[PDB]
Amino acid sequence: IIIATKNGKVRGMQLTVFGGTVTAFLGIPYAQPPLGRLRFKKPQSLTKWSDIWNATKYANSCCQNIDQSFPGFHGSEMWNPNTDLSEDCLYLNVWIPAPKPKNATVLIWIYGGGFQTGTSSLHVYDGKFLARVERVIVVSMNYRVGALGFLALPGNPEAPGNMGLFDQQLALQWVQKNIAAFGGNPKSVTLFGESAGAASVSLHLLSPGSHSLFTRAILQSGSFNAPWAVTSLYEARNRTLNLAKLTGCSRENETEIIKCLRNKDPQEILLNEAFVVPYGTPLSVNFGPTVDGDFLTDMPDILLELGQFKKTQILVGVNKDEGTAFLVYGAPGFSKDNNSIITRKEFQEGLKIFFPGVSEFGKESILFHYTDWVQRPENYREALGDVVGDYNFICPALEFTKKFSEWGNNAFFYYFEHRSSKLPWPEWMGVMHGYEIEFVFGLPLERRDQYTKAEEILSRSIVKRWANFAKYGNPQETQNQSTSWPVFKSTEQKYLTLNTESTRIMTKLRAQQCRFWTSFFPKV
Ligand X SMILES: *[C@@H]1O[C@H](CO)[C@@H](O[C@@H]2O[C@H](CO)[C@@H](O)[C@H](O)[C@H]2NC(C)=O)[C@H](O)[C@H]1NC(C)=O
Ligand Y SMILES: *[C@@H]1O[C@H](CO[C@H]2O[C@@H](C)[C@@H](O)[C@@H](O)[C@@H]2O)[C@@H](O[C@@H]2O[C@H](CO)[C@@H](O)[C@H](O)[C@H]2NC(C)=O)[C@H](O)[C@H]1NC(C)=O
Ligand Z SMILES: *[C@@H]1O[C@H](CO)[C@@H](O)[C@H](O)[C@H]1NC(C)=O
Binding site for ligand Y (CB under 6 A): 235, 238, 242, 245-246, 275, 278
As measured in angstroms, the least distance from the Cβ of 95 to ligand Z is 19
The beta-strand segments (E) located in 221-321 are 314-319
Tell me the residue type at 517: W
Dist. CA 279–CA 257, nearest whole Å: 24
364 binds, among a copy of itself, ligand X, ligand Z, none (CB under 5 to 8 A by kind): a copy of itself
Nearer to ligand Z, 68 or 480 (CB): 480
Q: What is the rounded end-to-end Cα distance, in angstroms, of the chain? A: 59
Residues in region 352-391 near Cl ion by CB under 5 A:
359-360
Q: Nearest CA to 430 among 390, 370, 386, 462?
A: 386
Of 87, 158, 194, 322, the active-site residue reads 322
Task: Tell me 520's DSSP state.
Answer: I
Q: Nearest CA to 220 among 125, 135, 326?
A: 125
- 328 by DSSP, 3-state: which? coil
Handedness of CA 74, 77, 78, 84 (dihedral sign): negative
Residues interacting with ligand Z, by CB under 6 A?
Answer: 54, 102-103, 185, 187-188, 253, 255, 460-461, 464, 477, 479-480
As measured in angstroms, the least distance from the Cβ of 385 to Cl ion is 11
Check residue 333 for interaction with ligand X (CB under 6 A). Answer: yes
Nearer to a copy of itself, 36 or 522 (CB): 522
Of 204, 369, 433, 436, the active-site residue reads 433
32 binds, among ligand Y, a copy of itself, ligand X, none (CB under 5 to 8 A by kind): none
Long-range contacts of the stretch 31-39 (C-beta < 8 A, 24+): 31/90, 31/167, 31/170, 32/90, 33/87, 33/88, 33/89, 33/90, 34/87, 34/90, 34/144, 34/148, 34/163, 35/87, 35/88, 36/262, 37/262, 39/87, 39/148, 39/261, 39/262
Beta bridge partners of 23: 14, 96
Check residue 339 for interaction with ligand X (CB under 6 A). Answer: yes
48 binds, among ligand Z, Cl ion, a copy of itself, none (CB under 5 to 8 A by kind): none
As measured in angstroms, the least distance from the Cβ of 361 to a copy of itself is 5
Nearer to a copy of itself, 335 or 512 (CB): 512
479 binds, among ligand Y, ligand Z, a copy of itself, none (CB under 5 to 8 A by kind): ligand Z
Question: ω before 356 within 30° of 0 (cis)?
Answer: no
Dist. CA 289–CA 292, nearest whole Å: 8
Tell me the residue type at 75: G
CA atoms within 13 A on the CB side of 269: 25
Dist. CA 160–CA 515, nearest whole Å: 36
| 322 belongs to the catalytic site | yes
Please identify which residue in 255, 263, 335, 452 interacts with ligand X, judged by CB under 6 A: 335
Q: Is 113 annotated as a binding residue?
A: yes
Q: Is 79 annotated as a binding residue?
A: yes
329 binds, among ligand X, Cl ion, ligand Y, none (CB under 5 to 8 A by kind): none
Dist. CA 516–CA 524, nearest whole Å: 11
Q: Is 433 annotated as a binding residue?
A: yes
Q: Is 369 annotated as a binding residue?
A: no
235 binds, among ligand Y, ligand Z, Cl ion, none (CB under 5 to 8 A by kind): ligand Y
Residues interacting with a copy of itself, by CB under 8 A?
Answer: 361, 364-365, 368, 372, 520, 523-524
Cα–Cα separations (whole angstroms), residue 214 to 82, 107, 135:
29, 10, 18
Please identify which residue in 38, 233, 260, 341 interacts with ligand X, judged by CB under 6 A: 341
As measured in angstroms, the least distance from the Cβ of 348 to a copy of itself is 13
Nearer to ligand Z, 102 or 448 (CB): 102
Check residue 454 for interaction with ligand X (CB under 6 A). Answer: no
Residues tagged in the binding site annotation for tacrine: 79, 433
For ligand X, the binding residues (CB under 6 A) are 332-333, 335, 338-341
Going by the annotation, the residues of the binding site for substrate are 113-114
